[PDB]
Design an enzyme around this catalytic site. Sequence first.
Site, PDB file in Angstrom:
ATOM      1  N   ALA A 190     -19.961 -20.851 -18.922  1.00 17.16           N
ATOM      2  CA  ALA A 190     -20.192 -19.494 -19.401  1.00 17.16           C
ATOM      3  C   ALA A 190     -20.479 -18.460 -18.313  1.00 17.16           C
ATOM      4  CB  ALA A 190     -21.322 -19.500 -20.426  1.00 17.16           C
ATOM      5  N   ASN A 220     -17.789 -18.169 -15.699  1.00  9.82           N
ATOM      6  CA  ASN A 220     -16.663 -17.360 -16.131  1.00  9.82           C
ATOM      7  C   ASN A 220     -16.957 -15.873 -15.989  1.00  9.82           C
ATOM      8  OD1 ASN A 220     -15.339 -19.751 -16.818  1.00  9.82           O
ATOM      9  ND2 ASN A 220     -15.902 -19.627 -18.993  1.00  9.82           N
ATOM     10  N   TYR A 257     -18.329 -33.614 -24.118  1.00  7.84           N
ATOM     11  CA  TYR A 257     -19.084 -33.438 -22.878  1.00  7.84           C
ATOM     12  C   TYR A 257     -19.490 -34.677 -22.096  1.00  7.84           C
ATOM     13  CZ  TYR A 257     -19.547 -28.712 -24.740  1.00  7.84           C
ATOM     14  OH  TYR A 257     -19.322 -27.455 -25.237  1.00  7.84           O
ATOM     15  N   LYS A 307     -11.818  -8.436 -35.432  1.00  8.49           N
ATOM     16  CA  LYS A 307     -12.278  -7.201 -36.067  1.00  8.49           C
ATOM     17  C   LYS A 307     -13.115  -6.396 -35.080  1.00  8.49           C
ATOM     18  CE  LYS A 307     -14.395  -9.708 -39.034  1.00  8.49           C
ATOM     19  NZ  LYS A 307     -15.244 -10.152 -40.169  1.00  8.49           N
ATOM     20  N   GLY A 334     -13.608 -19.100 -23.502  1.00 11.94           N
ATOM     21  CA  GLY A 334     -13.966 -18.205 -22.418  1.00 11.94           C
ATOM     22  C   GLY A 334     -13.702 -16.745 -22.719  1.00 11.94           C
ATOM     23  N   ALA A 335     -13.089 -16.456 -23.862  1.00  6.47           N
ATOM     24  CA  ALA A 335     -12.799 -15.074 -24.225  1.00  6.47           C
ATOM     25  C   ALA A 335     -14.104 -14.314 -24.446  1.00  6.47           C
ATOM     26  CB  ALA A 335     -11.926 -15.018 -25.477  1.00  6.47           C
ATOM     27  N   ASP A 385     -16.927 -14.872 -22.895  1.00  8.66           N
ATOM     28  CA  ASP A 385     -17.528 -14.682 -21.574  1.00  8.66           C
ATOM     29  C   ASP A 385     -16.877 -13.472 -20.916  1.00  8.66           C
ATOM     30  OD1 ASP A 385     -17.378 -18.250 -20.832  1.00  8.66           O
ATOM     31  OD2 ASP A 385     -18.922 -17.082 -21.881  1.00  8.66           O
ATOM     32  N   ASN A 390     -13.200  -5.984 -24.534  1.00  8.29           N
ATOM     33  CA  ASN A 390     -12.131  -6.725 -25.197  1.00  8.29           C
ATOM     34  C   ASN A 390     -10.803  -6.658 -24.466  1.00  8.29           C
ATOM     35  OD1 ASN A 390     -11.503  -4.316 -27.886  1.00  8.29           O
ATOM     36  ND2 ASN A 390     -11.544  -4.147 -25.648  1.00  8.29           N
ATOM     37  N   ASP A 444     -10.354 -21.518 -18.620  1.00  2.41           N
ATOM     38  CA  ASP A 444     -11.575 -20.886 -19.102  1.00  2.41           C
ATOM     39  C   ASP A 444     -11.666 -19.414 -18.735  1.00  2.41           C
ATOM     40  OD1 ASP A 444     -11.942 -23.803 -19.120  1.00  2.41           O
ATOM     41  OD2 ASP A 444     -14.009 -23.357 -19.680  1.00  2.41           O
TER      42      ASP A 444
END
Lengths: 301, 301, 301, 301, 301, 301
Positions: free
Chosen positions: A35, A38, A103, A223, A248-249, A251, A275, A287
């Site tokens: 996280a 990234n 993991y 949305k 990863g989007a 992050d 975005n 990622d």
Amino acid sequence: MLEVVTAGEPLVALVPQEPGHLRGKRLLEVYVGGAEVNVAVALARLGVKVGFVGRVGEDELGAMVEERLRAEGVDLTHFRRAPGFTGLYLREYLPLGQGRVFYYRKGSAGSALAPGAFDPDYLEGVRFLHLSGITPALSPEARAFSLWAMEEAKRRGVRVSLDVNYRQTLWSPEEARGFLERALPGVDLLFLSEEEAELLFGRVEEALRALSAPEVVLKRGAKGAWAFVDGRRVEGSAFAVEAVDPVGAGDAFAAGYLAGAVWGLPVEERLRLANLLGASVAASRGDHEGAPYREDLEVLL
Amino acid sequence: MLEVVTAGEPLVALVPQEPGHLRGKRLLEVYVGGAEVNVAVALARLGVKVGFVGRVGEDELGAMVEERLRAEGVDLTHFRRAPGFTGLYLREYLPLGQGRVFYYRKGSAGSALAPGAFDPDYLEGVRFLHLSGITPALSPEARAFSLWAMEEAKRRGVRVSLDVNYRQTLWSPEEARGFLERALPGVDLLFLSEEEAELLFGRVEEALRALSAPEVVLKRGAKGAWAFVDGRRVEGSAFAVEAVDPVGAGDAFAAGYLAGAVWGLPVEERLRLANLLGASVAASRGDHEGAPYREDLEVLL
Amino acid sequence: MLEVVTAGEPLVALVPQEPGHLRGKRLLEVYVGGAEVNVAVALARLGVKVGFVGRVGEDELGAMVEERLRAEGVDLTHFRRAPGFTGLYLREYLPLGQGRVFYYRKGSAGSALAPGAFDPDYLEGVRFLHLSGITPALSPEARAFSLWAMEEAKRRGVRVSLDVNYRQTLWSPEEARGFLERALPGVDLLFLSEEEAELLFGRVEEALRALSAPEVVLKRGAKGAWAFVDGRRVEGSAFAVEAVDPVGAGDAFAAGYLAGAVWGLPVEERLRLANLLGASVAASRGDHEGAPYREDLEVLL
Amino acid sequence: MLEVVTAGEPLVALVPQEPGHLRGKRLLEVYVGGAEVNVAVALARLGVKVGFVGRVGEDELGAMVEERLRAEGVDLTHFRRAPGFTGLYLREYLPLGQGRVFYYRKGSAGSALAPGAFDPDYLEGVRFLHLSGITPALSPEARAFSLWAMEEAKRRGVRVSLDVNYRQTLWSPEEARGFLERALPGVDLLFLSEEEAELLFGRVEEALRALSAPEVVLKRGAKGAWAFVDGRRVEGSAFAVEAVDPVGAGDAFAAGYLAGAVWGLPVEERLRLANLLGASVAASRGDHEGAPYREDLEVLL
Amino acid sequence: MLEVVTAGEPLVALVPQEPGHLRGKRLLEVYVGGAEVNVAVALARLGVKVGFVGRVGEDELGAMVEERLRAEGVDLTHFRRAPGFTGLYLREYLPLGQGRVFYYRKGSAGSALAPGAFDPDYLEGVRFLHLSGITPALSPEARAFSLWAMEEAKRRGVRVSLDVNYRQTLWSPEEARGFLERALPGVDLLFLSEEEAELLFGRVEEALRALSAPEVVLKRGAKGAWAFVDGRRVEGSAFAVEAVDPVGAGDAFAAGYLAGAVWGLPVEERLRLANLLGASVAASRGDHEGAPYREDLEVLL
Amino acid sequence: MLEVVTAGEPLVALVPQEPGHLRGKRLLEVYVGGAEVNVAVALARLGVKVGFVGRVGEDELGAMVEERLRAEGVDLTHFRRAPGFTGLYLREYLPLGQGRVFYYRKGSAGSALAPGAFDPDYLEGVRFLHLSGITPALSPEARAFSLWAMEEAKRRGVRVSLDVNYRQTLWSPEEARGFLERALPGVDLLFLSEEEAELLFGRVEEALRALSAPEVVLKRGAKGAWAFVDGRRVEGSAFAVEAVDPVGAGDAFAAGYLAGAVWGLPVEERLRLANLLGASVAASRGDHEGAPYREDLEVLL
């Protein structure tokens, strides 16, 4: 001088080349994830001076994480390989969209992070201190590191940015609520998902009442998303782009928002930017692969 | 009826497609490995009825290990997926030959093996029970299972075959020596390499007095191998072939020797068969990929 | 403080994945190359503090060269992307061994190097300044830079190391001889191959009288190499390894010899180290891929 | 006898396997490109007798261009490799659609083309002489070649087909307008983009006034396209297909229009055919990969 | 005990990695195919006990078919390799959707299948006996096998499931109608395509009159599908998913319907399940790759 | 005018990317093969004007064979695609060296070759007509074509070259011996291997008395080869190179010998040239990939 400092545990991602059950794959792609890792990379590619605090193991996978952080230009004053192993994980994305994650990070060098993991004077002069809810959920030490960290950042007059990131693998909604209950006092910018607010507070409304930080960004799938500053409530541009690899989007979105903030941009431009990075990453495998570089925003501008 | 029964912890191998440091690879090949797994599959390919006793996790890698064993025709009466994860490991072979391995198997569903793991009557009518020194080294429960297993096999007149495979990762030469000195009386066929003999007894000579099992096969790199049976010392065929991926070669070797034994072939042929299997595997990528099929020994015959 | 400083034109290499004519390939691998770049990265991997002086274009290939140098830990204080393009070249190795190269670098941002290209005080406290005969051959401005550079290095008591690397593409044996005869007085360590000595002085004997630098290392194919220091002639270890991709081996060799020097090792060890680096690179694909890391010399030690 | 003759400079395309910045790719795909080269191949695959005039270098890349032109059945009476190099270029297509191109063709064998580059009696009997605005923009010689060529085609009673192809890298809108201003008198079929008309005349209307050739085809993105014959103005079928690799789609469109013309089809069928080839190529990676074969149109018919 | 028994001729599929004419491909992907083979695998992955009757050749491709059927857990009591070859075929999918198929199966070991190909007591206790119209069209023996098979299944009180699968390569609409005319009396569940009904009866209505089996499932492209039981006519959920590789989607649909039936589910759930498998397979490359596993339906539930 | 004319059945080869059993491969490389095809392409690359007579099917694989021959510059005046399919075959090379082939060519459009297949006047002025013993073995019509062809060639003073290539798949050593004894009188250059001589005449000595053609070349594995011309026995250069893909090496050998003959070179040079071609092909993947271009013999000269 540093504009942003993020910390956490980097992970190495093992992903198949196409949709399908991991059990049938015979080849896997290697990526650097995590996280905060990234976020650090996305900021670094945008021209934001970022530092990353953490640990990897003294193994080949840790060396890989470090080369990537260094190649990208992140500050590793307090990042280093140390005895132990680098955590990894396997991802699989099914034909009709139902993905799964496995993991192999429990007990890794990077999961250590205890209070004092670095020198607080590092934070001095820094605009933001970004953290993710995954870190404090890793171990008691990390849970302690988090609180210590943002406290030492406040003490330095540094805004604390937190991305909830509710990992049900790390802890239950109860413990999550607990940490937040204790942590919330020091959060300046909180990143939240509608599903999270709903999964930890019943509905995307109650949560908005409880977690009342000076600024909250509520991500709502495709949305758009809502940014809550000065009681006002700005909405974000929805996106009609289909997910290639949605990992990863979130992050990337957080990084784009911080970049906009760090650059003193109105809440609309911060959301437009958020975005824009989020969409780019979602549009690429890996990622944080797909995170746009400074020169890119410039051209589209 | 089953002729051989192996048991141990299955592993999934991740290997780069060519020599070089793992830190620089972006692609990894996936293979099913595990000392005992490799022996089971090799025997299965040679037409020997074989059963594998063990556990994998209830994940995608565990399902992968299971389909592999099933595709090969290994009896899995006492093999099954259980709560937990499947262990994996990364491999790396450097340009000039220096290799390195990295394990992610601690606490796996497969390293659970404790005494009573399977129904002992499974061993009834069985020619050989095969184990690896890697198994008892995984944990005290596995060290116990090991002894219990051969005890049950001996109690049933089942020949016990043991491949030392000293793994410095798991235990010290002392604990290895300790386990050996205790297990040796129940052993009928001991596969040993020169390095191990020296690394555990000073020199490939002392180890042979100490570890005097009914039949001891001492692998000696490319210098062939010696088979010590009935005060006799049969010397094996040396091979002039270059190793592609040497990793699973020792297991392929033992498997061929076992197939030779199960078929009641003279020590000369067991060695010929053992050297054949070992070379075919050494010349191939993967842990046991490359192991020949019976139809191949038919033609080469 | 920096121990070594290299300088020259970086190149991006395009190479097919296997032998055969380039006209038939549909895929090309991308690697970062350049004689001096290769030396810098090899030293950087061995832990020698090294700085690279040079320019790439403001394109994607230039950005690629930069992240590579940065990922490796090469000081780029005086390395930067500038208007223009980055040079590249295609390679082809034919089945029976006959190879051929194709260049697309004429007029590149990197072949600009002219006197004063960097701040001379950068060389202060530096052990070695490394250059390649390829550099002065690129243009009169580069030929000037070359001389100016070592002049500045000598003026600072910096040892000047030069790898002849006679490129018939760039200049004739006469101009090469001309540059050499003029530059030699400022040279302290000269790396030379037999072919070059013969191709430029008739025989590997005359070249040694003419080109008599304080320390001359003469590479002799697989026949090892001779190190001429203090009227003494140390002979190097011959290696029996088959070339995979010989391209960057000479640079890996010089780099190892330099690391050996920078560490103040006996000529015997410099050669051992030089031969080691050269072999690891020769056994790998890419220009400098395959060059070992310090941690590797630690273990092999 | 030849039905169509096209000429220009072939190029070799280096494209990554997926979206993303070229700087992060380590593998590139090789293709044969070039505006007129793409048109010649598309016509040749449709059964149209086509000849291609041009030059490539005496290198591996030139040999590749020739094999492709020959394998496809193009007439190379006046096409040959000659001293010099074959030009190449690198393409990269970003996640969100913002692509970039890098050239390495300046001074290539194929950029030569001066008046008399071939024998004008070649054109005799030929229906069309297609050219692209890229050619005359390459050098003064080529600019001269173009005019000479279409003049020698008119003198032969051959219709001249020109695809504006405004390359801002080759020349400014002013020089572009200039050439067109001089060339327009001899153009029978002119292919134009809305953006071009707009970028060279202010608006897609003024341009339609100035460039008044006996037949103009105005391509308008996915909004079909308009064909202007006899003052009449036919519109083309818009397409709802998403771009895989939009490079060369305009060349394919031009080829489909010419094929329809060469086969004496009404303007509607010429347009239907044009974007049928255009769509196919846009639907495939590569420059002209995806161009349909004769037998294909037949089946869909 | 077996719940389902299917039979036919397995085939090995050779498919390119992306769209385009097979003539330009230099690499092909290998898959295990065959209408009934695809159904057996899909059922087996869902937890349905299935047996597959058939033959493959004593070649490498046959061994591949068997490993797959065994790895997946199909019952091969009556499946075996026998003298002769395993059939294969090549597929190619064009840019704009016009695909083509080439066969190399004529005279294969699996095309044999004559009446008595197995032991009818195998069918005893089995719920369904699925067959495909491809089988009886292969040879006179197979046409005989089919009738014999379903007759021996009826005699066993086993429902006969038939998937028309009109292969115009195997036989004409006339012979197809003939077989159906004779076979229809014993079919309990018939799977039909709208195009088939139309191509063999004029219109999707006449066909529904003639082929009046106790239960008919009419597949209608992406327009869902209709299930006809008790004179009633249930419609199925249409799907808005685009085809990756539509080959085998009809087999998967049939398998999902049977699984639902075999599990005693209402006609709506059978249809929901049918196109759930159909959609998954259509969403993946390969013939039956993408077929969901039991545990998957469970989670989405 | 043509110097050589070959004829036979073209084949498309499917080959895995590395050693190992075909049952385990998921990817196959596609190559154009066929004994005579391989000779034609090799000669074409060396600049010898060559024509290939034969047929492929009207499918994608046939179109592939045709573009290949066309790309190489082989005259196809009498080569064309005809109703039927193109034959293909799969190959597999096992780790230790044991190989196996699988054919799918029976009844192909290419194995039709019957007397009168092409216009005999095509052979006029031609130096050599090359055939393979594989051709007459395909069928009685092909066995007839073979004889008719050389009869027509001899009638035109065209030297007939024949490569025995005894394929046990097609016919027995008796039928092979039978065809040979009958065809030999029309043969001027016979290429034979030791195994064949022994496998067809007992020992490499008897075969030489029986099969006494004007010029006989006997290949002897890596032991070079003997050229028997004018009571003289020239011995060829033995090569110490390891086979990568030996498959098309014999054809490359004959082709080089033929090019040497067509150029009127001494037997010593024909052998040198023959051994050169054979090695370059043996060192490459594919059937004839690896065969050198004239420009290569120029440089190596």
